[PDB]
Nucleic acid binder design. Sequence first.
RNA 1: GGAUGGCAAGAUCCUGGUAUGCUGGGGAGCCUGAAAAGGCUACCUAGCAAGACCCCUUCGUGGGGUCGCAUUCUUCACCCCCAGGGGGUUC
DNA 2: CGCCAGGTATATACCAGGATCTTGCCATCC
DNA 3: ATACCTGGCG
Length: 942
Amino acid sequence: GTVPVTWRLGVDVGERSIGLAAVSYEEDKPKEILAAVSWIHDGGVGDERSGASRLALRGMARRARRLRRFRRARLRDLDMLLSELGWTPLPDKNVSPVDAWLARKRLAEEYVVDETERRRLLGYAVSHMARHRGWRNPWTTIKDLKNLPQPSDSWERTRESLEARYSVSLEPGTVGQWAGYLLQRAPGIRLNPTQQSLSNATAFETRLRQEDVLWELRCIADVQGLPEDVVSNVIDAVFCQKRPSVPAERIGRDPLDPSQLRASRACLEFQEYRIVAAVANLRIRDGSGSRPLSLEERNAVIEALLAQTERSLTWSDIALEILKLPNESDLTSVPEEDGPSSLAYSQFAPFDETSARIAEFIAKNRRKIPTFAQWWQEQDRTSRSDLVAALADNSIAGLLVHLPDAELEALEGLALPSGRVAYSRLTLSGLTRVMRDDGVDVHNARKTCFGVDDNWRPPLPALHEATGHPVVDRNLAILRKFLSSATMRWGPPQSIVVELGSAGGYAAVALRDRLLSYGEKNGVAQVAVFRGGVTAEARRWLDISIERLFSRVAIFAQSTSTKRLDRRHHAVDAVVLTTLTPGVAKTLADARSRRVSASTEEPQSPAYRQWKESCSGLGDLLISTAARDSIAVAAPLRLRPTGALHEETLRAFSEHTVGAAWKGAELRRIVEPEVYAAFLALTDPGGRFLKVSPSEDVLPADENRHIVLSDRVLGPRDRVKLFPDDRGSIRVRGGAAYIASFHHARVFRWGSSHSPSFALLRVSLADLAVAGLLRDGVDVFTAELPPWTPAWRYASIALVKAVESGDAKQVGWLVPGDELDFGPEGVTTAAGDLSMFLKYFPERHWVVTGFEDDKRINLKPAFLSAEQAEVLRTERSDRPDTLTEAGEILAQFFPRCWRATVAKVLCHPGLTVIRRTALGQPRWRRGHLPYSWRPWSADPWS
RNA sequence: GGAUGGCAAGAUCCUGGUAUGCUGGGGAGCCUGAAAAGGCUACCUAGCAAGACCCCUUCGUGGGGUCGCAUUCUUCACCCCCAGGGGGUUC
DNA sequence: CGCCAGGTATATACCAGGATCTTGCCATCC
DNA sequence: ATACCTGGCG
């Protein structure tokens, strides 16, 4: 079903956008622009204001959940430890706010005599300390915490500052002492500081260290006379912290054996592998040489490198002191099969760094590790290998033989080489055995152990596998969708050109490799990437002006080039990129910098004249193509019903008596859905929906009003909980929380065909949550939401009377980002500040951004860039008078653009909501992927 | 313009934690009130997405573990990849 | 009320140190 | 930035 055509692909990668183009060629001459679209993605940003990516915000929330859960676990274990001890935690209720501190300071000052009062005061103190234990390095241990200066340097300075500030010195004194004393002397004092950006005085500057809290705990242990047993146990209980780790899923796998994980660099197998590979590439002068090394010489230098305790032996030392060759020039190396030969004689040869680090650690700290020292003496290298890998894999998760503890806690103070290596451990071991037994290069050892071509590079990643970087993946997803659809509609491309704007250098390498795998699979002659501004010179030396290509008005009181203005330029950059070859971009990019840094008109060369004569046609191809409005700006749609279910701040409920008078606002606010349905029945007995207008009473103060429920019957003085605010809300964890942003909106309409009324139902994730519609197999856009859901509670009253009367039916659904093409007739309901905007920017393509209230929808122009308009707005307020009238208009408009009344939007015969293919062509057929439709005339659901 | 050894900085997440914050439950100090009932500034305590599942059972009517704000066309339908994950759908 | 148009609240900020990546620099050998 | 508030003007 694909018609083969000779074409070229062009990609222009931006920070928040990507320009894609498929262009057919004659010979090397462009005849027609098959497709040219500029997709506008978000860069993976989840909170636009923070800048945090969606992925990051998710991970933060995940780790917060697990922090809370582990804290629950250790606190319940602490309660279990100080039950059998005989102590008593702080009860949740009925205590004094200053009992914990009064405890923690008396226990550190005086010896409490009564054993019961001692035990409860201790229970108070340790319970509170575990609940407020301070900070420490997650990688260190409790026995490591015990070995730090106690008290802290920060705490000693804070304490000296407090002693001079409050004119009192406290022995010893602990942070509990100063806290309880300041909560006595100057009440209302805040302990740790905070910033919320006004006027207040705190008691502490820096975060308190767990070492200070442990210091206070041992002060109490000394003063109260506690045995070594229980004091050690309770410190291990209060400062119990899970040790950080990498999950085994995040380590790369070995390309030669994908069943195995990348080894640690500290690995003994790797140290041997590196030395054996370094020597296996050595050659010795025999004339008019050269020769491989004899088995004896190779073993000699391998053992000489393995045994050394420092990295001192150079290659000159190998060539003279070991191989006994006359001069250093008689030894060289060859790195590749059929490649050049060189060797720096001054450089050092590799050595086993981990065995040497263990050697110096044993020689320095031998008293502390007597059995390990003797162990690593006589054990052969196959056992040492497993031990070193166990040390590395427990030092990063991630045992093994006859381990005494006393030595083991010093063995964790050992610094081994960090980082991982390309190949697995068993792979290194096998490659060394073949290189040692057969005296052979690494490239032939590869073939001996595994069946592999000569030579072969480790496999390059494909398009359908991610980069982990959220900014690069938006580009990757759009690109692979476009390229798949282009290979299906037309032929596979002949050339692929990509341009980037180290932040995008990684993006360059990732995109390049994935397109290289694509090319060697589907057969593309040339695939090139370029940095960074090759297209700007290509254009403005071929006289392609983007404000002249698209007839757009001047913007400044100057004659500046407004190229970032129209978001279609990404596409046109793509289309011009398809005309390039590495040499032409070479000679153009040189000239750009040659000019911008240092009569006069430039350049010309045999490739440049050929390029220009072959590409002369584009000047008019672009005019014709932009005239027919063939260039499309698109925004991908977010349909997945995932994200924040509700706003995060819990809010306190209000209450309302059943017998009192009600208004519409107070009835929409009823929390219980059963109580809600009861009052909806009392407001209209045959009604399915709440048809009340807020700000206006609908029920009297019926003194004998009862509402019968299957739970219970309520009396006229009973109280029912109400949400705090007359806005879409839900109940989570005993509080009220506003719904989050709307997932989508459903477009209903009713009335005559020649003049119909429209309305929107603003559907949120809280709506789908309470309706239990997040199960499998649900269509979130057409699945009835009960009348109690916040969506129906806050629909337009016109809508809720029209839907219950059966006249209104769901006709479509809108989701943030999709496109509103008002066709050739354009916005006719223009009024106010919008119309003065349309006199200078005649925009017909609009993008949905939100659903502000129960009667409006938020639209931004699709072709104009928000960031450039912000540039203008910040510019006029700092440098005024430097704008045209259209510049002032564009500056004032864009922060919120069109905040349109839905009534004045959907009343456009034919207006099309456009849903594009990756190639930028509107789907018209009512297929399984989302498709275009017209609100004025579209078959209702079912 | 190649090869090799080393250094530094940056980027993206991942793991474990620290203070705040919010709601519920408390009460040291305090200001308005003849009250009566509510605000203040701190501190103590539980929880922090709604939820979906497993496991071990000594069967405790109680306990241990995972997933839950990413992968921008949900769900339904076709075409693909090396029996679970990842992709594409031309207007 | 229909239709605009201004104004404003949202959870937020640290830590050390792995895994996965990129640039830029230094030096010594062809 | 998004979804709330108030409020003018007819």
